[PDB]
Amino acid sequence: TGRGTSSRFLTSVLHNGLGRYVQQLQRLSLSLSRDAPSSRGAREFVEREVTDFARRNPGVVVYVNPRPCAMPRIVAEYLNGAVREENVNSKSVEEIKSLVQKLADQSGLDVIRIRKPFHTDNPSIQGQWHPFTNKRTALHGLRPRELR
Amino acid sequence: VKKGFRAAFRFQKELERWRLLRCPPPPVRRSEKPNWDYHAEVQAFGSRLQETFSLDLLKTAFINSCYIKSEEAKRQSNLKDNQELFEQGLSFSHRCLTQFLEDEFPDLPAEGTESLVSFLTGEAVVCHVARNLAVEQLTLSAEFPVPLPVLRQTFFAVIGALLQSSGPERAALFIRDFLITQMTGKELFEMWTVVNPMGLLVEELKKRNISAPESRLTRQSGSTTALPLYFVGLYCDRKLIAEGPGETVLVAEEEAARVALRKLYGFTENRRPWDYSKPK
Amino acid sequence: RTVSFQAKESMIRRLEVEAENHYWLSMPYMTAEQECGHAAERRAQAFEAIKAAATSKFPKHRYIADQLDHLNISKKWS
Amino acid sequence: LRNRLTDRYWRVQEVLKHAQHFRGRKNRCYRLAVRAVTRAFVKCTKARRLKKRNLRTLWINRITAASQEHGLKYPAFIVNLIKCQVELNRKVLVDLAIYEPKTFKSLAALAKRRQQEGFAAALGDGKEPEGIFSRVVQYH
Amino acid sequence: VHFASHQWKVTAEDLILIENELDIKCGERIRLEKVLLVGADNFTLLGKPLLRKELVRVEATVIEKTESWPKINMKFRKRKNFRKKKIIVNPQTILRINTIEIAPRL
Amino acid sequence: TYSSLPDDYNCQVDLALTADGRTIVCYHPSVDIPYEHTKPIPQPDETHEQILKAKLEVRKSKQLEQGPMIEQLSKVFYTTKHRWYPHGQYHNRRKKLNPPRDR
Amino acid sequence: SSFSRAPQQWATFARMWYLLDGKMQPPGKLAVIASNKLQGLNKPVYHQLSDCGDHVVII
Amino acid sequence: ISRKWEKKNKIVYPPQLPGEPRRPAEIYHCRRQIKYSKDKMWYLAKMIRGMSIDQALAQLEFNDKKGAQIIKEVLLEAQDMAVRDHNVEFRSNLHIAESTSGRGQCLKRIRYHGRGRFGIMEKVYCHYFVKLVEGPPPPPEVPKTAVDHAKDYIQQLRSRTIIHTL
RNA sequence: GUAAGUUUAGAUUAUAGCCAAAAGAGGGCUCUUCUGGAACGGAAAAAACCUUUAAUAGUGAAUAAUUAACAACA
C-alpha cells in the first residue's frame, strides 16, 4: 500500500513552536435536525458541551444551524486551507465530544505515510563527512609515486 | 430496471466528483460561501495570536483603496483607507528589523543588512506568511485572488494597527516571531547576491590591515577525468584562513572566498542559534 | 559429518549449568516428616473458594428502567 | 426477481482502486485484480517486520566503515565502549560518524584505550591498580 | 536524549515524532531529563551513563497531537480472502526542541 | 602525548575524567593544513562544460549514430552502454511530477 | 562546514583513486581489499542505491 | 452509438483582446460507416500524421490500398469546409494534427467447413477521424546530442542524498 | 505442588493418516507397542530433524538454534 500511495516529510505550518504556538483550527460548522432520532446525540452535545468548548478555545468560530436534516455533519477548516468533513449520524454525546477534541489538536497537513520521524535543518555542527576527512596530508602535496 | 432510489442517489454524487476533476471551478472568496459573520471572524483573528486589538483600528487595516472604487461604481448604478497605517507599519518594521540584525551581526556590512531586510519584506515572504494567518480571507478588495502588492500592503497595515494599540515592545515580538523565523536554515548568499566574491574579500582584509591571501591547492583527485574534485585553501602570512571544494580550480577558489567571508561576518552554519527565549 | 566448533561449545555451556542444578537440589531444608501438615489450612481454604463459584450460577435481574428508556429514542426539541 | 443486489458497483471499486498502478490486465479485470491485491497485502504485512532488521544491518555496515578509518575492528569498538558505561545505540552512532566527525574520533580513542587497559590487566597478574578508565561507577 | 524508548540526536529547532499519546496539552513546555551526551564544536561531555542534572537542561514544546495513516495487517492463512483484513491506526504527537543549555559546574 | 590515536590528520584528542568520576570530558580542536604541504595553483592554462566538450569530441560522421555515440559516452564516465538507452512510454508516464524535498 | 549546498554534496560523493602493488602477494587477499573499495563499503555514507564506488588501480 | 466529433465544430470562443496572439482555426471531420478493417486503416492514418495538406494528398494519390482513396476524399472535404465555413484564408496553410481509425457496427454470418461444421464470420466496418489545424507543420524531432546526454548524467549525480539517516 | 472432576439434558461430525526415534514379531518391505512433529529462524533448496508460549505499532536492546573440520615416525 505504500507504493500505492503518496508520502511526505515531517514539517510544521509556519514554524509553529519557535516563537509562539498558534492553533490551526479556526472554524467549525454543525448542522442538526429538531426532531429526528438520528441526530439526538448531537442535540444533547449542543445542550451541554458546545458552550464550554467554545470558551476553552477562543480562536475557533463555531456555527450551529438547526434545520430539517437527514444526517448531522461537522465541517472543520484550517488556516493552511485544508477542509475536513465528518458524519455524526446516530452517535452518542461522548463520541461527538471526543471527536471534536481530536480536530482541535490537528494541523491541516495530510495524514499519509511520513518518510522519517525526525527533521533537522542544521544536521551538522562540526562539518559533514567527506572522503578527505581522516586522510593525512603529504609534504609538497606529492601524489603517490610522483618523483618531483 | 431495479427497484429503489438509493443507488441512483449515490451515483449522482460520483458524477459530481468526475465533473469537478475535469472542469475545476473558478476560485471564490470565502465571504460569498455560507457560514460567514464578519464581526466574529475579526475578533477571533486577534485572540488567535494572543494579542489585543482595537476593533475600529483593525477593521480599517483590511479596507483597501481599490475596494472603495468598486463600491461607488455600484452605488451610482464613506469608509476610510488603510494608507496611513501602511506607511507607519512598514517604517517601524524596517527600523526594527535593522536593529535586530545589527546587534546579532555587528561586523556584517551595511549593504548586507539592507539586502536581508529587503529579503524579509518582499512579496514572497510576506504573501506566504499572510495567507497562513487568514489575512487574505478578511481582506476587502475588488479582485480575487488578491494580488500580491495588495496583499502585502494589508499585512503591514495590520502591524501598524497593532503598534498603535499595544506599543513598540509588543510589535517587536510580533516581527521576531513571524518574520525573523523565515530565515531559519538559509545560507547568507542565498539572501544576498554578491558577484566577484574575491574582490569584496580583498577590500575587507585591507580595512583590518591584513595581507592579500595566497591561493594554493590543498587536495586533489581525478584531475584528468570528467568528474574532478578540487580543494583550494586561501593562505595568509603562511596561515590558513579558509578552504573550499569545487569541480574546477576556478570554481573551488571562488568557493574558498565565500567560506572566508562568512567567518569574518560571523554568519557561519555553526553560529549560535537565535534566541526566542526572552519573554520580554 | 563433522561437528562444528560452535555446536561443541554451546553444548558444553548448557552442561555446566545443569551441573550446578544438581548441587543446589541436594540440601533439603526440611525432612519429609517435618513437612507433613505444615500447609493444610491454606489448601483447604482454596477449594472452598472454588466450590463457592461453581454453585453460584443464576439468572440476572430485570428492570423497568431498561424497558422504558427505549422511549427516549424519539426525544426532540419542542 | 423479487430482490436483487443493487450495490455491486461499489463493491467492485473497493478492490480495483488498489490495482490501478499494476501492469497488464491485473489493473482492470476483477477476477485477476482481486488475486493480485491480496498477494500485495500479504507482502506489505511481512515487510513491516523485515524492515527493522534490514536497517540494523545498514547501521552495522556503516559503523565498520567509520571505525576502520581509525584502525579499529567493529567488535573491539562496540564492546569496549560498553565497558566504559556508554549506552549509545547503533542508530545514533551512525549519525555521529556522518555528521560529527571530531566527536566520533574522540570516542574511537576512548574505546582503544579501554582495550589496551584490558590487555595490560590480563598479562600482568596478581594485585595491581586498575586502569583509570576501567573504574565502574555503582548504583543502589 | 533518551525519550520514550528511543534515543534521539537533537539540536535546537528540531522536530521529533512520538508514536503514542502523552497527556500534555498543545503549546506546553516540557523538560527532557535523560541526556547521554552534549557536544559542541571543540568539546564534548559523556555521561556514565547519564549526565548530572546541573550540567545540561533541554526543553521542548508540544506542537501537534494526531493519528497515523491506516496500516494494513493481513495474516498469512490458507483461504486468505480480501476481507480478512485489519486497519491499524495509532495516536501520535510532535515535539519541537527549543533550547540546550550548559553551566560551568564540571 | 596521552592520546592513543595520532593527532596529525583530523583533530587532537584529549580525554580526562572529572574528580567525582561521573563525567568524561573531551577536548578536540581542529588541525589546519601546513603551508609546506600545499601546491601552487596552475594559473597558466575553466568551466566544466568546456571540459566535457573536449572529452565528447565530434570528429567523424558529424553527429554520430546512437550506438557509436553511446560507446564514446561510456568510456568517458566509466559505465556500460546499457545505462544510456531510453525507455518506453509506459515507464515515462509513471514518473512522479513533483517528488518531495526534505530541506 | 559553511560550504554552499552544491559543493557540499559534490565533495561528499566524490570518487577516489587508489593504488595497489601486487608483487609477491596472494591474489585472494588482494581481491578483498579491491572489492571493499569498488562497492564503496569504506564510506559511512554507503547505501545500495547510491552508487558510491571508487577507482582501484593494481600493478 | 456516440457522435461527438461532429459537434466539436460548433464551439464559439469570446472575442480576443487586441494584445493577444491570433488563435489558429480548427476543423473536425469524419466518415462513419466504411466497409474496411480498422486494423488496415490504421497504417494509412498513421502515415499522414504531422504532414501538411499538400504533402498528405500527394502520398495518398500513389498508394495502392483501397483505404487510401477513401481518406483522400475526406481530406478534400475538410479543406473545402475550412475555407468556406471556418474563415481560413489560404488553402495550402493547413496541417494534419490528428488522424485515427475506429471500430464500427459489424454483422455476423456463417462460414462453412467440411464435415457439416461451421464458423462465425464478421463483416467488419470502421470510422475515420481527422483534425485540421491552420499553420505550417510544427518542426520535427532532433535527437539528443552527446553534450545533452552528459548534462543529464551530472544532474543525476547531483540529486543524490544520504539515504535513511539524520 | 496445584484446579479441575462426577452426575443430568441436548447434538453432530469422524470411523484409510504421513515421516522421524525406540522394542519386538513374521525375513527391504508387513504388522503390533511407547514418544515426538507440522516456522514466518536454521540445516543449500527443505510437510515430518533442530531453535521457538498467543497477536499489535516503533529508524530501540539482550539472546537461541546455526555443513563443516584442521604420511611417516613414535
Ligand SMILES: [Mg+2]
Ligand atoms: Mg533480529
Ligand SMILES: [Mg+2]
Ligand atoms: Mg473470430
